[PDB]
Design a protein around this nucleic acid. Structure first.
Ligand SMILES: [Zn+2]
Ligand SMILES: [Zn+2]
Lengths: 115, 62, 814
RNA sequence: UGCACUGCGUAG
RNA sequence: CUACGCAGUG
């Protein structure tokens, strides 16, 4: 009973925290645009996520996908903010290169913000 | 036999390495895990000894 | 020379090879080559591929080119032919139209259409009233169905104006309903398929209708964008606050399903939490190039990498074994089982194996007959829905899944929900679909291979609902002895001998076979999983209505088949397959194994010439099989009974959830009347999309030796009390590795070692009767080590190191 | 740190 | 029979 109340409170707190982490500016746009009001879940992060995280296994995919400080994905322009390694160290843009690729702890996690 | 005790030595060396927080570094852990797995699956004694020596050198470096 | 023909008449019937401008090869030849595949004889397939520029001869120089797992590039080569196949389909429709305009009634066969799509047959055509022509296309389309997905014929449908050269169609990202597109595709391609097709399975008359509609939807869904499929969500107001909640689901097989109790308590809180809608909405966008699978979002600011620790080593036991003469140079018994450590990218890499799951369209008539036959193997069992208070949970301290694992274990949620709340949740699941998130966890266990193994922990709600739905049938199966499925039958106390005697029952010229399923849990077609679910749910005729059963199937599909997968803080969309943490994992796989065996037998019987068969009964059986397969809609109960009896007499199966031991007649298998290993290989090729190697398959000529391997145990015939019995023994390496290496250092030494070594000795005792002396010495080593451990720790305990206790465990007294 | 089956050991 | 722990099998 007491633990049941604890679980209910925890679930409600998690849902409300996610709500605080949720923004309605674009969600309302897509909801109003839809005739039926139903949208696939998968597309919600695509058209509403402010932050993008990309996992790079090797340098080849790095040049293919997000070589520069700004790249295009999901019909949107993303400008890079951070690039960390598998060890959670702040890898700089200059260090990323063919010559220094063997010295990097792949995969590389690159975090960017919507432009 | 030398092959079996070499495998056991490799296992214990990997255990102590893991207890040394080696897993914090991704590439060093990858190398150690690859060497240990090859040692376990190795069918040639000389290659097993070479890989055990390499892993022991990894431990000795720190 | 021999060409493939699909023949039907009074004298003979079946699809087989016969000795009997136009192209050299016909569509029947291609279908036969791709449905009866033998690496030794691929001349027709190679010539067809080379002639039409699918690939070059050098491609065949490379070995394992046919294998999908070893050489995925083969999928591309077959795709080069798909367009051609597509063209043929269109031409077929045109031909049918002409016949309808000419008042011609006839049966269209694959062997009368060349690979250019032209139809050159004008026989069996009888003039009728113009505009009344009704061609028969059951055999043609049904036999051609498997080829369509393998060659990806409908790929052009993803391009503007159905032209590969022109760009892809840019569908609205918010669009999720493609019912009109499905109708249009069906009308253009399968125009004369008289059976009604429902794009949305919600409107399916029965289970067979659901299978038919899902089979068509599997093919039709490949055209539509992947993002469209998945949970359907809405923004709603609850308690004056906005929430994003799932109100429907788009299934690649079942179409669009809308919840019936959509509105805008503990049950509601769990429904919301288990729903991936909130998590995905609050999660950042993710692009993961480490896998070809779809990436949904990231719930964590940083990606998480999990590693497998190395196994602990027991120096006391290894030293004791060495001192007693084991692990010497050249000894037969060696340590080949270990704990293999893995890097941080292992888990995701394992998930990448889901790439081997491909959209597979099955021969619908064959699948319908096979499911009807398979239902006979489950007639003795009884099933139904049970209440919350009738549910038995073995362990309450297991993980509740994501996000429920954060707050507690399964015990917490089972205690929190009263029986009324659980019943309310179950009834809700009978009316609505609840998508769930399944976590992928590396499993720490012994293995002889370096590959890491993953398990799928499903959410608590799905486990509870599936338990209430299926536990009655599952317990009924586990409590039955002497049946084909041997789940719940202990090997101890003579159980192994009883099972082996049951398998051998009444076989004229018995030989034994056993096969393996490569990447079974990952490469299993979605259609076969849906069929297994329907077979398990068919026990709910009285306690559930059609709508309730369909919604339960939809919930299972949204929680098992194409659920949302949580891996290292990232969400992904499972392409298909089966999850290992399901409430019905073992039994669904047993159903799949039985279905594959029945399909192999059907293919073997029909592939036979028929004329050469000198047995009137077998010829009539083949003719009636063809009749009930490609000529008759309604299920023929009498023929199903007869075929089931025939299989039981000449094909005795022992199935445990992946592992099959089959006793089969010598002469019938030799003459093609009964399936052989090659038939299973072909079935796994054109249905399971995996190549079965003969190395992993075994055939035993003599029954006295027994099955080569079953559940990792080998068999010996030994003398006990003047009676010869079959006794299972394990590989000594596995037992020795278990003894030497342990999961954690907590179980390294102490009293707890006594139980572990007692269990290992119980398992390894049968090695005493093995002719090899070291195998027997393993058990004595274990007993002596138990003695030494007891001495170090220091009357009843005597029984632990006295061999009478282990003698008793394998006698039929209990 | 999953779903089932089987067999053991300790308390009642 | 129930509670706990262990071992094997898929
Ligand atoms: Zn239908
Ligand atoms: Zn029911």
């Amino acid at each position: 009973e007491d633990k049941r109340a604890k679980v209910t409170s925890a679930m409600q707190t998690m849902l409300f925290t996610m709500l605080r982490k949720l923004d309605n500016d674009a969600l309302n746009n897509i909801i109003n645009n839809a005739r039926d009001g139903c949208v696939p879940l998968n597309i919600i992060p695509l058209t509403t996520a402010a932050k993008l995280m990309v996992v790079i296994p090797d340098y080849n995919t790095y040049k293919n996908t997000c070589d520069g400080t700004t790249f295009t994905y999901a019909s949107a322009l993303w400008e890079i903010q951070q690039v960390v390694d598998a060890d959670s160290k702040i890898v700089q843009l200059s260090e990323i290169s063919m010559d220094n690729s063997p010295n990097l702890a792949w995969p590389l996690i690159v975090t960017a913000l919507r432009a | 036999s030398k092959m079996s005790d070499v495998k056991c030595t490799s296992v214990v060396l990997l255990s102590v390495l893991q207890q040394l927080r080696v897993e914090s570094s991704s590439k060093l852990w990858a190398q150690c895990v690859q060497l240990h797995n090859d040692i376990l699956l190795a069918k040639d004694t000389t290659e097993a000894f070479e890989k055990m020596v390499s892993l022991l050198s990894v431990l000795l470096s720190m | 020379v021999y060409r493939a023909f699909d023949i039907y008449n009074d004298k003979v019937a079946g699809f087989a090879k016969f000795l009997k401008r136009l192209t050299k090869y016909t569509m029947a030849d291609l279908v036969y080559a791709l449905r009866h595949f033998d690496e030794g004889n691929c001349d027709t397939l190679k010539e067809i591929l080379v002639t039409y520029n699918c690939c070059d001869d050098d491609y065949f120089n490379k070995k394992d080119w046919y294998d999908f797992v070893e050489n995925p590039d083969i999928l591309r080569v077959y795709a080069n032919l798909g367009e051609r196949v597509r063209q043929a389909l269109l031409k077929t429709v045109q031909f049918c139209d002409a016949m309808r305009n000419a008042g011609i009634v006839g049966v269209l066969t694959l062997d009368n259409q060349d690979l250019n799509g032209n139809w050159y047959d004008f026989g069996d055509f009888i003039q009728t009233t113009p505009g009344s022509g009704v061609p028969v296309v059951d055999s043609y389309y049904s036999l051609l169905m498997p080829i369509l997905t393998l060659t990806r014929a409908l790929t052009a449908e993803s391009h503007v104006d159905t032209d590969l050269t022109k760009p892809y169609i840019k569908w609205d990202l918010l669009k999720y309903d493609f019912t009109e597109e499905r109708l249009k595709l069906f009308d253009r391609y399968f125009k004369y398929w008289d059976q009604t097709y429902h794009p949305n399975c919600v409107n399916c008359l029965d289970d067979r209708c659901i299978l038919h509609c899902a089979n068509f939807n599997v093919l039709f869904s490949t055209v539509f964008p992947p993002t469209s499929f998945g949970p359907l969500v809405r923004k709603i107001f609850v308690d004056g606050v906005p929430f994003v909640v799932s109100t429907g689901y788009h299934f690649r097989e079942l179409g669009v399903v809308h919840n019936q109790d959509v509105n805008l308590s503990f049950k509601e809180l769990l429904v919301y939490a288990a729903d991936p809608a909130m998590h995905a909405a609050s999660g950042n966008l993710l692009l993961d190039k480490r896998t070809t699978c779809f990436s949904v979002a990231a719930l964590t600011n940083n990606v998480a990498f999990q590693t497998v620790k190395p196994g602990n080593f027991n120096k006391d036991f290894y030293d004791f074994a060495v001192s007693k003469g084991f692990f010497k140079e050249g000894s037969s018994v060696e340590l080949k089982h270990f704990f293999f450590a893995q890097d941080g990218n292992a888990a995701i890499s394992d998930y990448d194996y889901y790439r081997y799951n491909l959209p597979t369209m099955c021969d619908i008539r064959q699948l319908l007959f096979v499911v009807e036959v398979v239902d006979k193997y489950f007639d003795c069992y009884d099933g139904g829905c049970i209440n919350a208070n009738q549910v038995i949970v073995n362990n309450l301290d297991k993980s509740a899944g994501f996000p429920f694992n954060k707050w507690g274990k399964a015990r917490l949620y089972y205690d929190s929900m009263s029986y009324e709340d659980q019943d309310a949740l179950f009834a809700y699941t009978k009316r609505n679909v609840i998508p769930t998130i399944t976590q992928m966890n590396l499993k720490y266990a012994i293995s002889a291979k370096n590959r890491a193994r993953t398990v799928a922990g499903v959410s608590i709600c799905s486990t509870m609902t599936n338990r209430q739905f299926h536990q009655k049938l599952l317990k009924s199966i586990a409590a039955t002895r002497g049946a084909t499925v041997v789940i719940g039958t202990s090997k101890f106390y003579g159980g192994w001998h009883n099972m082996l005697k049951t398998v051998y029952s009444d076989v004229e010229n018995p030989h034994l076979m056993g096969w393996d399923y490569p990447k079974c849990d990952r490469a299993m077609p979605n259609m076969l999983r849906i069929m297994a679910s329907l077979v398990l749910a068919r026990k709910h005729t009285t306690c559930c209505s059609l709508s309730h059963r369909f919604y339960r199937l939809a919930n299972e599909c949204a929680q098992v088949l194409s659920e949302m997968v949580m891996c290292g803080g990232s969400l992904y969309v499972k392409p298909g397959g089966t999850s290992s943490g399901d409430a019905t994992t073992a039994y669904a796989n047993s159903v799949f194994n039985i279905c594959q065996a029945v399909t192999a037998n059907v293919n073997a019987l029909l592939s036979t010439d028929g004329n050469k068969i000198a047995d009137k009964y077998v010829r009539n059986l083949q003719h009636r099989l063809y009749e009930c397969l490609y000529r008759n809609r309604d299920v023929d109960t009498d023929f199903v009974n007869e075929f089931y009896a025939y299989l039981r007499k000449h094909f005795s199966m022992m199935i445990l959830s992946d592992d099959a031991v089959v006793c089969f007649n010598s002469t019938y298998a030799s003459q093609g009347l009964v399936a052989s290993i090659k038939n299973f290989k072909s079935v796994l090729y054109y249905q399971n999309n995996v190549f079965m190697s003969e190395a992993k398959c075994w055939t035993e000529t003599d029954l006295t030796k027994g099955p080569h391997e079953f559940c990792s145990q080998h068999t010996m015939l030994v003398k006990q009390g003047d009676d010869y019995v079959y006794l299972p023994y394990p590989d000594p390496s596995r037992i020795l590795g278990a003894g030497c290496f342990v999961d954690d250092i907590v179980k390294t030494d102490g009293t707890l070692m006594i139980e572990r070594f007692v269990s290992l000795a119980i398992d390894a005792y049968p090695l005493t009767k093995h002719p090899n002396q070291e195998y027997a010495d393993v058990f004595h080593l274990y007993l002596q080590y138990i003695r030494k451990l007891h001495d170090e720790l220091t009357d009843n305990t005597s029984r632990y190191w006295e061999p009478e206790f282990y003698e008793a465990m394998y006698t039929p007294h209990t």
